[PDB]
């Protein structure tokens, strides 16, 4: 079937080389421009792949785990053909997908979607540290030192069971100098809160991304994911499998919003406009709204010659009578502020506020996970009904609120976290 | 005489079982082919008394829903071809495979190419007559079909599980034919059938297919387990269409197969060859509010009576005499207002919160117990029986995954419902303070053990409380009658004050009503079963202007379908009412009139319009809403001032 794979590869090569709209070869341009800035990926809109030849899209969507590596390979070959004079070295290019297929909500994904390309959305609630996955393994036999290699496509390999021509039962080892690796990151996606069924607890998926999709999102961001709904046999029922998504695309200043915000800065009535625009259904409380605008913007953070650093963040306490719209103002600020977290004082614990220990079900090893203050870093933590908070929690607020740090010594993990809040 | 691939038997031959076990008889191929023809004939020819084919209509509906499940009523199979009902009871694992093939055949006949929509059909065995409690199951039930009652105590995630799986031998020509995965054990391949030897094995990645899987811990109902015993439980396993049909903290009725399997762990820790067991569910039912098109038309018909509001309010807790303001507040809460969100920026509570504050022996607890039976989603909690987390939400470290997960409290379970809190005055304030967010912002914002999230908690809270010291004292204002503070009291946006005054003509009518109600409830007091139901109906009509069975469906319909609008409401009427109520509420001990009480008038007017099934709120709804709120405020006062306040506010109420 290698001739058939070669014809798939040549079909994709022709798609890169031939696809054109309104006199522009958009994917030749995008691939060249991506090479110039030294990001080795290509973002493909599958509307265009469908429009070019739907047979290719049918092959892709029938079995993406086999077809995606061939498309990546085709991109590498075209990349060389449009950036190197051959007869006078680049890595395996990442494919990135844009799509407008109808979204499957995160709760409805089940066994009939296994290995299909899927489009969904949710809130990223955690983002693991980066990790190294192999693309090319250089391999050696422990006894005879017969060397071979594994070239890997990360869509789901293992070391060979015995020597490929006594030589021992299980003999192969990796040569870590010649082997090539890539960045891999794990994310947890929670379903959109306004899509949760009545009385249900919100459900979530573990999911993975690599190369130029790592570090592209932070916790709390609302995203649409394109990826392969897929399976792996975890260590922790019977004949059961853990579901996960292999991400193929993410969607979450522009050169004219630059102009819009210059024009809005130039408006003389700006402060009144923003003041009116805070919680517009709440009548009155004019000075409080003005102060909320100040808290949103913040002062200016500073560093002195000594290395000492000075707070830019403003803290505001609204203490007062019932039904004065305090909670309504906090629940508005959690909407408008670009980073924000909302908690209530009686819902809190010191751990869930500063940071907590976790044991990752995937590695099965410890890692530290951020609480509300960390998730609010760079923005506002809205602590509603703050007077109901326990004393130890209010103690735990002090470092994160004034020193703007959290110092940690838990499970042997000594650590200090930042809390610009 | 006949082709061995088509030899088939008579029905009396099927009654004349002559293999040893039932399963040995079902698996005899002539018997199997006969059974297939038998069940096909059953589905195509069993009818309603109208002559309409039952499973013709159910299959038509199955395809319209694109469903994978067909609900076969067992009582129908017991009425015709009852031997098949016997085999289905005694040997369900074999029979259901046959019946699934037959059901797919029947629907493929009804809809050509339904194989494109689902490659399989599962029959759901509804109305199985014999029932067991979890304590009641035994060895003699093993591999039998069973119907069990319990509450879902712990529900796991919706995992994929292998269904049909070809395997690869890593020696020789690899592929092995497709094994069928059960709910109980891993597949074993003792030897590879090609090389007839041992070797390593691996799942074939091309020819394998998955189904949904979900275990559930099912446990004895607390209103069933006898005293002096630990409640018993079993691991239910749900497959395919049955996953997430239920959520924890709810009663279910479970048709399934009670199956055992070997487990080295159980043998290890117990020291005997003792097997584990499950209930592989075949069907799940939650355990009234569902309604028909004629019932819909009935709701429309009765609603346009201009007296419907008072007939509903009289119907509320019908065996409770008097207390018409309580019944009004309960009606308003149980229908609720309309929740809103302006441009997505400003969400507004739709729920109406009611506090019943008053003397001992004034039916406050019984009113809550009535609503517990009457509402669609509801839960009931009392005093020191509650905790803050047990009320809103909680977290636990899952013993399977070792990760932290939330578990919903009462106000999550009662989401879109009503929550009933008895002895509100004698909860700890460190529990009471948890109510604030869910009661007004309609949410719970946990930040614990790395979990940081906001849950929806759309509940109307109805609470019952005794005043300070033991009973009400109208010489005092409200703030000295009760220990509760202004924030929590302001959230209860109707207050009912209940007093046990000695009053001869009221007490005689009350006492007569209570005695009449007691004898009307005594145990000893068109067949025999239907005849006593007809007498029961007339007994209910002795006190209730509409049936409770009708009222519950009417409530659920009005809640879920009807969304009133305040089209051309009298703004200045309401505004003057709020202005005067605020001015007279300057008395520092009185009920704290607040903006949320103005919203209460608007929510209540919507709730009355909801009782009328009305798209628009009338002046009469708004006038009644004003009158309710004004009365609630006026009676929250020390008696030295109540007459003057009544006289002042009469200009607003006595127009109606």
């Amino acid at each position: 079937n290698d001739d058939d794979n070669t014809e798939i590869i040549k079909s994709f090569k022709n798609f890169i080389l031939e696809f054109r709209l309104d006199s522009q070869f958009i994917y030749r341009d995008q691939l060249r421009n991506n090479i110039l800035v030294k990001n080795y990926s290509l973002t493909v809109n599958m509307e265009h792949l469908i429009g070019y030849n739907e047979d290719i899209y049918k092959k892709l969507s029938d079995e993406p785990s086999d077809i995606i590596p061939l498309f990546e390979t085709a991109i590498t070959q075209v990349a060389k053909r449009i950036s190197i004079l051959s007869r006078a070295s680049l890595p395996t290019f990442q494919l990135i997908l844009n799509s407008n297929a109808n979204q499957i909500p995160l709760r409805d994904l089940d066994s009939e979607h296994v290995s299909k390309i899927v489009r969904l959305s949710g809130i990223i609630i955690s983002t693991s540290v980066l990790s190294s996955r192999a693309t090319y393994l250089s391999i050696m036999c422990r006894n005879c030192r017969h060397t071979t290699s594994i070239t890997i496509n990360n869509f789901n390999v293992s070391l060979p069971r015995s020597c490929l021509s006594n030589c021992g039962p299980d003999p192969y080892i990796i040569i870590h100098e010649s082997s090539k690796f890539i960045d891999q990151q794990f994310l947890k996606l929670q379903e959109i809160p306004e899509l949760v069924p009545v009385g249900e607890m919100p459900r979530n998926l573990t999911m993975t991304c690599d190369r130029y999709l790592t570090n592209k999102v932070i916790p709390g961001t609302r995203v649409t994911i394109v990826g392969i709904y897929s399976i792996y046999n975890s260590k922790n029922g019977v004949a059961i499998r853990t579901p996960y998504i292999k991400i193929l695309g993410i969607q979450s200043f522009t050169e004219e919003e630059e102009e819009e915000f210059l024009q809005l800065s130039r408006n003389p009535k700006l402060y009144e406009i923003l003041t009116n625009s805070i919680a517009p259904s709440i009548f009155g409380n004019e000075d409080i709204k003005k102060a909320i605008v100040c808290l949103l913007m913040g002062g200016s953070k500073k560093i002195l010659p000594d290395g000492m650093r000075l707070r830019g963040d403003i803290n505001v306490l609204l203490l007062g009578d019932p039904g004065t719209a305090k909670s309504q103002l906090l629940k508005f600020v959690e909407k408008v502020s670009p980073i924000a977290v909302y908690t209530s004082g009686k819902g809190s614990s010191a751990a869930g506020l500063t940071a907590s220990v976790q044991r990752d079900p995937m590695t099965r090893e410890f890692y530290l996970e951020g609480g509300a203050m960390v998730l609010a870093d760079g923005g506002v933590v809205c602590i509603d009904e703050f007077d109901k908070m326990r004393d130890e929690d209010r103690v735990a607020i002090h470092e994160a609120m004034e020193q703007q740090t959290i110092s940690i010594a838990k499970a042997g993990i000594t650590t200090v976290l930042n809390s610009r809040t | 005489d006949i082709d061995p691939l088509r030899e088939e038997l008579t029905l009396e031959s099927l009654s004349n079982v002559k293999a040893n076990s039932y399963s040995e008889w079902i698996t005899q191929p002539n018997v199997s082919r006969t059974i297939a023809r038998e069940l096909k004939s059953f589905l195509l020819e069993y009818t309603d008394e109208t002559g309409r084919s039952v499973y013709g209509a159910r299959i038509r509906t199955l395809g319209e829903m694109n469903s994978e499940s067909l609900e076969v009523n067992y009582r129908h199979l017991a009425e015709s071809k009852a031997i098949l009902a016997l085999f289905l009871a005694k040997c369900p694992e074999e029979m259901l495979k046959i019946f699934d093939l037959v059901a797919m055949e029947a629907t493929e006949l009804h809809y050509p190419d339904y194989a494109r929509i689902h490659s399989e059909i599962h029959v759901r065995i509804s109305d199985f007559p014999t029932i067991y409690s979890l304590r009641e199951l035994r060895e003699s039930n093993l591999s039998s079909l069973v119907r069990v009652t319990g509450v879902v105590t712990r529900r796991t995630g919706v995992f994929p599980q292998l269904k049909y799986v070809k395997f690869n031998c890593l020696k020789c020509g690899s592929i092995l034919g497709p094994f069928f995965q059960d709910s109980n054990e891993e597949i074993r391949i003792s030897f590879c059938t090609n090389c007839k030897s041992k070797g390593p094995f691996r799942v074939n990645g091309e020819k394998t297919v998955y189904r949904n899987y979900q275990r559930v811990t099912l446990q004895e109902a607390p209103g069933t387990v006898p005293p002096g015993r630990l409640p018993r439980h079993r691991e239910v396993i749900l497959l395919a269409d049955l996953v997430d049909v239920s959520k924890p903290g709810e009663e279910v009725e479970v048709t399934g197969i009670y199956k055992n399997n070997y487990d080295g762990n159980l043998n290890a820790k117990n020291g005997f060859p003792v097997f584990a067991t499950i209930i592989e569910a075949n069907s799940i039912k939650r355990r009234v509010f569902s309604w028909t098109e004629e019932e819909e038309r009935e709701f429309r018909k009765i609603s346009r009576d201009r007296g419907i509001i008072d007939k509903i309010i009289s119907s509320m807790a019908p065996s409770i005499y008097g207390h018409r303001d309580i019944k009004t507040a309960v009606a308003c809460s149980l229908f609720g207002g309309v929740p809103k969100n302006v441009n997505g920026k400003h969400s507004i509570r739709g729920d109406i919160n009611v506090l019943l504050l008053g003397d001992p022996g004034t039916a406050k607890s019984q009113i809550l117990k009535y609503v517990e039976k009457t509402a669609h989603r509801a839960v009931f909690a009392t005093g020191q029986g509650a905790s803050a987390v047990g009320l809103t939400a909680s977290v636990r470290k899952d013993p399977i995954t070792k990760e932290w997960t939330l578990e919903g409290g009462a106000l999550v379970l009662a989401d879109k419902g009503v929550c009933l809190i008895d002895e509100f005055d004698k909860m700890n304030d460190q529990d009471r303070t948890s109510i604030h967010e869910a009661m007004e912002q309609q949410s719970i914002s946990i930040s614990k053990a790395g979990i940081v999230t906001t849950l929806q908690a759309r509940c109307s809270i109805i609470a019952a409380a005794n005043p300070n010291g033991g009973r009400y004292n109208s010489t005092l204002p409200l703030a000295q009658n009760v220990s509760l503070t202004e924030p929590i009291l302001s959230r209860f946006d109707i207050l009912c004050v209940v007093r046990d005054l000695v009053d001869e003509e009221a007490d005689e009518r009350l006492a007569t009503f209570v005695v009449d109600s007691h004898v009307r409830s005594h145990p000893e007091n068109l067949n025999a079963r239907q005849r006593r139901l007809q007498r029961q109906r007339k007994k209910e009509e002795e006190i209730s202007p509409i049936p409770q069975e009708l009222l519950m469906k009417y409530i659920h319909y009005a809640r879920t379908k009807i969304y009133p609008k305040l089209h051309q409401m009298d703004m200045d009427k309401v505004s003057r009412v709020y202005a005067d109520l605020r001015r007279e509420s300057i008395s520092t001990g009185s009920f704290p009139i607040t903006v949320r009480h103005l919203e209460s008038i608007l929510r209540i007017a919507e709730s009355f319009a909801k009782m009328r099934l009305s798209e628009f709120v009338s002046s009469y709804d708004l006038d009644r809403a004003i009158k309710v709120v004004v009365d609630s405020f006026v009676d929250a006062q020390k008696v030295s001032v109540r007459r003057q306040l009544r006289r002042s506010f009469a200009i607003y109420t006595l127009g109606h």
Binding site: - | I2, P4, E7, L9, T10, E12, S13, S15, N16, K18, A19, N20, E24, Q28, P29, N30, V31
Partner: protein, 665 residues
């Protein structure tokens, strides 16, 4: 291909539904064409399983339960029809389906054998097929107290009514098939667990030999149920009047039934020779002796308490053992040292007939219920008092002919019949003077002796050890009877010269060979030898000449190897061994032949505290023998210290020193 097997099973399943079923309007009701269906099923047995040697139909018929779920209902309802009709006198047709049901029962209960001639399919299917026959036997004996048994006798009675000549070949055959039915129902027995020996044994042996099917207990299969159902259907009355009426086409099956009734039951169990609790107390006291014995052989303190004994030998060297009891008893220390050796001498090993007294364990007994005991003993009593001599004459006067063609099974069952009833009547006549030895006079009629001699001689010449053992038993009972009638008295002197010369030699050669064969073989050799010696002594051609033929070393090996089972032997058997030793050693005085260490070992083990019963009469005989034996061994060693070496070995067949070794001058 197995496609054929599933097609065959589908066919037999369809036939199973054609036979009939219960009618709800519960009674069993026959199907349409039911007679033709029964004939077609008989034809399936012939067409496939017999003609192709398969037993596949015999498996399929059991899978679809035709015998239990159709045939016995048909027969029992037909029995009730004919019974009620007899009291109140289209049966012409229903008689036919009853007969064909009986034919099918005879087929499906037909005894199973496996040989080198059996097909691979047959020997593969043998086990589960036997199990199904056991379920059949249970159902036949149990159902309605076995009313189908009365159905069978009624079917036979409806041809016994007509004249001796009027019984056509079909009627003769029908009576023979009824006898084969009763024979088969007696004869079904649990199969042997037969294991492949290509693959080695695991670290544990076979987990269990139990081969019963799950719906059967062994008591369902036991003789007790047979006796009860045969009595409650008067099958015993049928057989008794049948054998009385004999005045011979059916004679061989009729003999065979009595063989199958007798093959595994011991005569003494029919004679006594709070009672149950009293005897249980006796039994418990007897095994409490073994409890105090093992307690003497047990440490007073915990297993980890063990110090070390050292046995310094008579030489300046030391051994070591951990036994706390052995630490104060060197006997235990020595024998425990010997027990500790990992090495053993490897020992080498060592069918178309049923289990019997020929091959059972020597203590086996049928534990009758007393009602069944009375019914069985009175049935065989009345048989002896009527049917014995006539039947034995008929069948032995057959077996005078066709000896060359007599199948091995037929030979052994005839010999066992002879032995069993002769032994029973001798025992009953020892117990009752009312019982007469002349009531088995046919045994002594000279044709019988001649035939039994021909059987044993030919079996031994052919080296047919099975039939040789059977004839050895039959000879023992013939000689036993001869001694009784010699005391009770002409024919005695006739047999006491007819058995001369080569017969004396043959009888002398069985106990030479017996050491190579099983315990029961050896036991029958010892029994025969004791009978032979008492017979010859009772007569006393020359007495010294004959006994010299027995007193030779392989006979002593056979007696020793028999005696090696001493704990498992019975007191009377040990008495017979030691009476033989009394003759050889005390009377014949060939003492040198017993001065060998194997006997010394065995004597110590049986005289040990954990040896014989302290109160045993046989222990008294052993003690008496041992006292004299040790005295003579001491005397011979004192006269001849070379025997300290010679004690280890076989004696010197070199005569020139052998005489000196034997007598010492």
């Amino acid at each position: 291909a197995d496609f054929s097997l599933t097609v065959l099973r589908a066919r037999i399943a369809l036939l199973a539904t054609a036979i009939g079923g219960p009618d709800y309007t519960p009674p069993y009701k026959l199907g349409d064409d039911c007679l033709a269906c029964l004939k077609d099923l008989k034809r399936w047995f012939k067409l496939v399983d017999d003609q192709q040697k398969r037993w596949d139909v015999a498996m399929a018929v059991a899978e679809y339960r035709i015998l239990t779920d159709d045939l016995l209902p048909i027969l029992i309802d037909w029995e009730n029809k004919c019974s009620l009709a007899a009291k109140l006198a289209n049966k012409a047709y229903y008689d036919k389906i009853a007969l064909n049901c009986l034919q099918l029962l005879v087929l499906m209960t037909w005894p199973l054998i496996v040989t080198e001639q059996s097909s691979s399919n047959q020997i593969t299917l043998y086990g589960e097929l036997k199990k199904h026959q056991l379920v059949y036997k249970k159902t036949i004996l149990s159902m309605e107290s076995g009313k189908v048994l009365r159905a069978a006798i009624r079917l036979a009675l409806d041809v016994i009514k007509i004249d001796r000549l009027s019984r056509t070949p079909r009627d003769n055959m029908v009576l023979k098939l009824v006898l084969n039915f009763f024979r088969n129902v007696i004869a079904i027995e649990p199969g042997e667990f037969t294991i492949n020996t290509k693959k080695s044994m695991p670290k544990k042996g076979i987990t269990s030999i139990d081969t019963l099917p799950p719906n059967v207990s062994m008591d369902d299969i036991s003789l007790n149920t047979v006796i009860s159902s045969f009595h409650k259907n008067k099958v015993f009355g049928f057989l008794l009047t049948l054998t009385s009426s004999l005045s011979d086409f059916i004679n061989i099956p009729l003999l065979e039934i009595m063989f199958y009734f007798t093959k595994d039951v011991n005569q003494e169990l029919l004679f006594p020779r709070t009672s149950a609790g009293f005897e249980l107390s006796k039994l418990l006291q007897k095994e409490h002796q073994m409890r105090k014995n093992v307690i003497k052989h047990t440490s007073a303190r915990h297993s980890r308490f063990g110090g070390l004994l050292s046995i310094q030998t008579p030489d300046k060297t030391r051994l070591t053992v951990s036994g706390s009891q052995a630490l104060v008893d060197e006997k235990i220390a020595l024998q425990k040292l010997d027990d500790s050796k990992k090495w053993n001498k490897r020992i080498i090993k060592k069918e178309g007939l049923p289990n019997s007294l020929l091959n059972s364990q020597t203590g086996k007994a049928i534990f009758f219920t007393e009602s069944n005991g009375k019914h069985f003993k009175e049935f065989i009593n009345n048989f002896i008092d009527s049917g014995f001599n006539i039947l034995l004459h008929s069948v032995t006067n057959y077996f005078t002919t066709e000896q060359d063609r007599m199948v091995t099974l037929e030979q052994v069952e005839y010999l066992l019949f002879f032995a069993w009833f002769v032994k029973y009547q001798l025992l009953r006549s020892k117990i009752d003077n009312s019982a007469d030895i002349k009531q088995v006079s046919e045994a002594l009629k000279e044709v019988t002796f001649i035939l039994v001699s021909s059987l044993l001689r030919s079996a031994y010449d052919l080296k047919n050890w099975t039939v040789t053992h059977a004839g050895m038993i039959a000879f023992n009972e013939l000689l036993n009877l001869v001694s009784r009638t010699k005391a009770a008295q002409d024919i005695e002197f006739i047999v006491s010269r007819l058995f001369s010369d080569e017969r004396i030699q043959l009888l002398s050669n069985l106990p030479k060979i017996g050491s190579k064969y099983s315990l029961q073989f050896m036991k029958s050799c010892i029994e025969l030898t004791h009978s032979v010696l008492k017979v010859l002594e009772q007569y006393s051609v020359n007495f010294q000449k004959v006994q010299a033929n027995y007193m030779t070393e392989p006979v002593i090996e056979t007696y020793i190897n028999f005696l090696e089972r001493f704990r498992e032997l019975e007191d009377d058997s040990i008495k017979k061994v030691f009476s033989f030793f009394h003759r050889v050693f005390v009377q014949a005085k060939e003492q040198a032949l017993l001065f060998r260490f194997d006997l010394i070992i065995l004597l110590r083990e049986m005289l040990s505290p954990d040896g014989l019963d302290r109160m045993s009469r046989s222990r008294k005989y052993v003690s008496q023998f041992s006292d004299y034996f040790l005295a003579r061994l001491k005397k011979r060693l004192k006269k001849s210290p070379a025997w300290f070496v010679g004690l280890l070995f076989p004696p010197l067949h070199n005569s020139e020193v052998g005489f000196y070794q034997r007598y010492g001058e």
